[PDB]
């Protein structure tokens, strides 16, 4: 706190309290008593723990019947109107389409939909794979994740 | 219809004005104007002006006759005290208070 360093009054002989810095955490516009810091909170899950979690939720998705598997996903031109058209045809509202191979046209077609998520089978994460209600998986992504967990 | 009349931030203190309020709380208005004429304090000046205003509003807005009016309610509330400093001996200050009053007069029949 940007202040002075003098005692605001002397110690003995005034009817006021004992005080020796105007910066004190009990005063007004004094310091925070236990002031914080830029910190790092990164919890460290183990490799086998993270893979066991992903195995657990994939088993839970197939038991709860929410992982619709298809042979491929493909749109011709990047039209989100066509992507929402195709998704209404497939009868889904909240949907995670994790991709077998890279489809930049699907990147462009799903960048603006506010409920659809398009990923890689490698870059998957349990927050997404839990929160999204109907996970659509390419069969190539099934092959890549059977490789990924083994 | 009860006709009200206020005087806000009167330059006197509430404990002083409440004596001259307590004199005429409940009378008829002509007798109250007599009492406040011949009461010799500064609060008599103030509440005589406010009773003049209340009689004038009650006769003009509502249209009632002067003999019918009668001071049912009258009170003096504390107002925003303004704070000065009087310096006194051995260096010490003394914050002195200049109080104010909100004088309300209800007048009806």
């Amino acid at each position: 706190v940007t202040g002075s360093g003098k005692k605001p009054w002397r110690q003995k002989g005034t009817g006021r309290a004992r005080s020796g810095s105007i910066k004190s955490p009990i005063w007004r516009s004094g310091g925070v008593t236990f002031a914080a810091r830029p910190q790092d909170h990164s919890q460290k899950v183990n490799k086998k723990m993270y893979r066991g979690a992903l195995k657990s939720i994939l088993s839970e998705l197939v038991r709860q019947d929410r992982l619709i598997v298809v042979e491929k996903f493909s749109v011709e031109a990047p039209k989100t109107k066509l992507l929402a058209q195709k998704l209404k045809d497939m009868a889904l509202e909240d949907v995670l389409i994790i991709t077998g191979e890279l489809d930049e046209n699907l990147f462009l077609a799903a960048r603006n939909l506010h409920k659809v998520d398009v990923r890689d089978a490698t870059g998957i994460d349990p927050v997404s794979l839990i929160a999204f209600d109907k996970v659509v998986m390419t069969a190539d992504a099934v092959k890549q994740v059977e490789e990924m967990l083994a | 219809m009860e006709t009200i009349a206020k005087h806000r931030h009167a330059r006197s203190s509430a404990q002083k004005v409440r004596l001259v309020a307590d004199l005429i709380r409940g009378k008829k208005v002509s007798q109250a104007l007599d009492i406040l004429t011949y009461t010799n304090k500064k609060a008599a000046v103030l509440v005589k002006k406010v009773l003049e205003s209340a009689i004038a509003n009650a006769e003009h807005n509502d249209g009632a006759d002067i003999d019918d009016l009668k001071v049912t309610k009258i009170f003096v509330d504390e107002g925003p005290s303004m704070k000065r400093i009087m310096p006194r001996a051995k260096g010490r200050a003394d914050r002195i208070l200049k109080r104010t009053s909100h004088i309300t007069v209800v007048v009806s029949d």
């Binding site: 005034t14 006021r16 | 303004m82 704070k83 000065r84 400093i85 051995k90 260096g91 200050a93 003394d94």
Partner: peptide, 23 residues
Amino acid sequence: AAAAAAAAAAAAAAAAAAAAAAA
């Protein structure tokens, strides 16, 4: 206008002992 002539009370200067002390 509105002068608002109410500055803060910086009053206490010092003291002394100056008293017949029981000792």
